[PDB]
Design a protein around this nucleic acid. Sequence first.
RNA 1: UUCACAUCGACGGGAAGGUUUGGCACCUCGAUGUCGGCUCUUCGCCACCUGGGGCUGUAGUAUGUUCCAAGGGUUGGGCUGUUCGCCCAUUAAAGCGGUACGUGAGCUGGGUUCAGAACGUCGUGAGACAGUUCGGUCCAUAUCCGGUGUGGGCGUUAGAGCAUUGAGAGGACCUUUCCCUAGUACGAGAGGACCGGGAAGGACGCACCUCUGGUGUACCAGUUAUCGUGCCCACGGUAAACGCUGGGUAGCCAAGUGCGGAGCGGAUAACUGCUGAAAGCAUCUAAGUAGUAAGCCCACCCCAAGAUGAGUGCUCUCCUA
RNA 2: CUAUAACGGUCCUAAGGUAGCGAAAUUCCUUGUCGGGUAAGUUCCGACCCGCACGAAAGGCGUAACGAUCUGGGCACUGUCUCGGAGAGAGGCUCGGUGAAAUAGACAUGUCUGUGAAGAUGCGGACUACCUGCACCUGGACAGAAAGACCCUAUGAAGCU
RNA 3: GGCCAGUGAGACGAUGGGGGAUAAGCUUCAUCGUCGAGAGGGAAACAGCCCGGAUCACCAGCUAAGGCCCCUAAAUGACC
RNA 4: AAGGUCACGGCGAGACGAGCCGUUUAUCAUUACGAUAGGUGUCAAGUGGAAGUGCAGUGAUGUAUGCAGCUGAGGCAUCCUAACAGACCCACAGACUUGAAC
Lengths: 116, 46, 61, 121, 37, 212
Amino acid sequence: MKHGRKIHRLSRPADQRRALLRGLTTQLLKHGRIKTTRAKASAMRKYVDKMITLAKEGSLHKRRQALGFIYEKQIVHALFAEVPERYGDRNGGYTRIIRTLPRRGDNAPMAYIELV
Amino acid sequence: AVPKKRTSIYKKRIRKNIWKKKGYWAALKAFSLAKSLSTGNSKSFF
Amino acid sequence: ETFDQLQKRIPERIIEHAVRGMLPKGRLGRYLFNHLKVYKGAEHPHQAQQPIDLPLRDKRI
Amino acid sequence: MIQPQTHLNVADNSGARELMCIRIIGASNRRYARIGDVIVAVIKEAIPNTPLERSEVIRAVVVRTCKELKRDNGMIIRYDDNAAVIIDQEGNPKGTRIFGAIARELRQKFAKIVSLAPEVL
Amino acid sequence: MKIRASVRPICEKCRLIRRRGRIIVICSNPKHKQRQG
Amino acid sequence: VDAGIGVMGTKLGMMSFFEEDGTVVPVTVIGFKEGNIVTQVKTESTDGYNAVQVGYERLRDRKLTMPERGHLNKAGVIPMRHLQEFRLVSVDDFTPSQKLLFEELFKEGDMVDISGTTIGKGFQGGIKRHNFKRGLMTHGSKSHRALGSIGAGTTPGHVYKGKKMPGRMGGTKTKIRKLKIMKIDTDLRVVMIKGAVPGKPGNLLRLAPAKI
RNA sequence: UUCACAUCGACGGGAAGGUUUGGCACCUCGAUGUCGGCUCUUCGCCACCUGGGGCUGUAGUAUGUUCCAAGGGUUGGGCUGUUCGCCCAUUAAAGCGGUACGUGAGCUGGGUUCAGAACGUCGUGAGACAGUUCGGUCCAUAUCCGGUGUGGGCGUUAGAGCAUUGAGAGGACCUUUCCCUAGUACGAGAGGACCGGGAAGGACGCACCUCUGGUGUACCAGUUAUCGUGCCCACGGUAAACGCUGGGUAGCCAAGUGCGGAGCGGAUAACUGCUGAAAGCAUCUAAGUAGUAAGCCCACCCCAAGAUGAGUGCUCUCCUA
RNA sequence: CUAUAACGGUCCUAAGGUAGCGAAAUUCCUUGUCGGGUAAGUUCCGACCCGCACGAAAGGCGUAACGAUCUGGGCACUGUCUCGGAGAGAGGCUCGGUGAAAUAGACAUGUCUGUGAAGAUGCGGACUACCUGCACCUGGACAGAAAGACCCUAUGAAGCU
RNA sequence: GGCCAGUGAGACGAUGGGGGAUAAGCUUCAUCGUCGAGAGGGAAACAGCCCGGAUCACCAGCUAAGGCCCCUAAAUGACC
RNA sequence: AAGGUCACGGCGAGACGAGCCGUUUAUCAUUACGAUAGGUGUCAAGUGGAAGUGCAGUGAUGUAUGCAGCUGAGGCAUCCUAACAGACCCACAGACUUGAAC
């Protein structure tokens, strides 16, 4: 039974799931709009809201935790120079979960992530 | 585990038609999605 | 479960158990099982076809 | 929680050192012996200048335990060892000086253990 | 009680009474209080 | 047949009441979303039995269908979600027109019974439904935790009905009995009750006096 | 001590049961897998305990034997492959059996002692022992019935949303010490009640996470080896599905916490009776009728009108051509 | 004194078992009796010798070291257990693709009880069951295998003496 | 006699016995009946028990064994 | 048509079906409903003093900022994001017969 276990685990083990989270939110912050599955979409939604509001207060500690979470070096330093100028006054809700057709070969419920 | 005998044409057409009726139930859903995919402001299907 | 226990508890199952073993228990006695209308009260709620009293041929009751 | 194969230390100077307790009396659970339950001990080793030798079946009282002790006052008392008092069925032990502290609920049935105790918490 | 299924009335006052189907034997001495066959 | 009308309330967590004597008692906290308004009484005349029908959880009218809200507006009361009756012996004096009954009737009655949906545990095995034992974990064994033997030999030729198999454990309502009442709150709309009600905080809970 | 029948009952006799060893060889060898253990039933009474009673060579405690009663229980262990059995600590008691070992298409050891080897004995020998010892593969995705859960269709005579009655069925109805009565009846003492209450337990069951914890791969903290982040700091990856540890919220769980097992409710079995005749005496009965069992039913908790006998009550909607 | 036989005679052999061992890998009775270990020990060790049926190169009695050898006991250690509980993966469940197999007379394939080639969904009487899926469990279909390795028969086969 | 087959495992029931335990649906014989190789009716079902011997048709009648409350045909027939 | 089903956002419900709770000018005001899930802001709560700087020390390290820093499966608030767009099933007095009064 799963009463109140609000972690959203995928079809992958724990450390591989962490690497899926970090890599897919990294390239989500790289391209902005991205094609995922819906489980991967909500799993991106929590963590990428944590990474938008993490470097919202652009200190050194937030920048070092944020650089520790994201893989690529030059994308964290392109983030806190962009998120207070764009996502000020939004106060949560930084994405959008536009769904699409299922994937040929799996009938996988396929989703599509914005930044709005 | 090993089946004692075989099934009739009776029970097999019942079970296969329950399988294909279970295929029938998942296309009026696809008719609804194909009808909502048409002209209208829907925040999906980029 | 004995006779006085049903006759204290639900009496209209007594006669309903007596005549159910009198009818041919296939698909057709099950159809004419519903023709039986047993009521424990002094009055029956039927005014269907003006029910005439049943003719007996039994001299020992 | 005192199983029927545990080792309990002695809480008196009756003449033993530890004991393999066997199959408690009173509470018929016998796979969970809480405080105040007498146990049919056997002597694993003893003091060899006393009429309590090896392999001797005796009755004792569980007076300390590593398992908790729910009190109505809100407190929960627990020790770090297991202890018994080599007892007789008429109340008092045959060892006078009680070692270590005990609780105070067992005063309602075993008053001589409390009266001979160094600390009653 | 004695279920002696076939012993005779043995004291001099062993009256013999069939109650509730069964045959019993009563006497002044409670030794002889029997339920027969 | 119950010995009186009861109320229904929702569970709101558990805590510990400190009695002034010094004891520490584990109590469940009961809230009341809306007053248990008597909606429909069914007497011996127009029905085969006698029961008082109350309800709970005043809502928005969109949440409630046309037969439901038509039934509730037949009594001239607020539209509400939950709805249950208590069967009561024919000495009753209850009008179905908006009797907003207050919760004072349980404090002197220091015995109450409660019913509620226990938390479901889904399709659980025989090791936790019916308190079985597992096999040997080692010594070359293979029937770990399994159900073991199911029936007797050739002469039955089947298994007895009602035999303890795995199945869906929780989800049905239960009633735990004679639960002694404690400190009500006439302003916090909260009743302390020393025990453990069926279910997590949030569910409906029948709160009706005892039947001993 | 007298005394066949409180209790045993010699010499004999009459039955029931199919649980041992047997007899027959009637189904099965194009295969019905023996003995023990684990798990999990269910049933019988020829009753070990619990409930009621009779008799006692029953003063009371405890009995001996026996009647009704199978609802419930019938421990943990040392030996042995063990069934059985012996012993220890107890317990109210540690019952005997059926269900093909009850149960190996649920699971494991001694064995129909399989193939290797050794000891004794037999045989000239190959080899053999209803003698002993060591080692020795055990398969499997449920077609159908059966079961436990959970739907979908259709029916319930318009279509629905709720609300419940309850036919029927399940579970629970178990049990022990300690105290008052009372050291009172009884007994020369020693001992020590029935009956009616209370309290603490045990198993079982239904729940819950407030406390105490176990886990908790949401988590945070310490540290080893190493590779990356250009480098120091500080982090990230890996050391399976936590690198190893230290704790933990919410879940789940118990060892923890609450609750349950109620009934001057109905009828009975054994028994005690009240009037009371067939034989003007009598007798529990032939008429009527009273006390009373953990047993039966109801009440108790849940499911429950597919209860096709398909229930009852309230409410909504059937419009245009 | 009860014993037991140092010792004796007799029958038959080729000779009637020497040292040492001895309820043993050997002992049926037997869980022999005693002592140790254990709360309790048909297993173990130390003894007695009543050795069914030890015994001196088919060697006997011993012992250091050695053994994935057998067996008895103890310390530490732990889910083996009391008495289970939680968590992580691969399956299992659902969806999309691909897609078998053993088996199979036809199956419109209930329970009790009785009968019957003596253990019946198929026969009889009664009771109970709306139809049909899905997920688990395996009591029955004397379930699947595979012309019973055990037992016996063959005027069978073969190895060996 | 000629040509030419099978069969040579029997089973139960009555009587006459032996083996047994005058136990077995047990075993072996002797006479007979049935089944084997025999359908139908009665026996609830059910090889051997009773009636009875099926060429075939009839939406014909009378009977044997056995039955005449209902399931299920015929008497809730009569008198002791 | 009433009422359902799909979809949609999920659940203290759950193998799948089920079930349950939402499905937005998602109050306005004098006092119980129109916050479903995520994010955000705070409060319980867990580990427990983070980085950077200064100071002391030859250095390991300790100390002040600082119950700070992360965690936020739980509570409340907040419409910032997604609850948009839909679709489909069920309709049109409910056969036949007696009795009663209107």
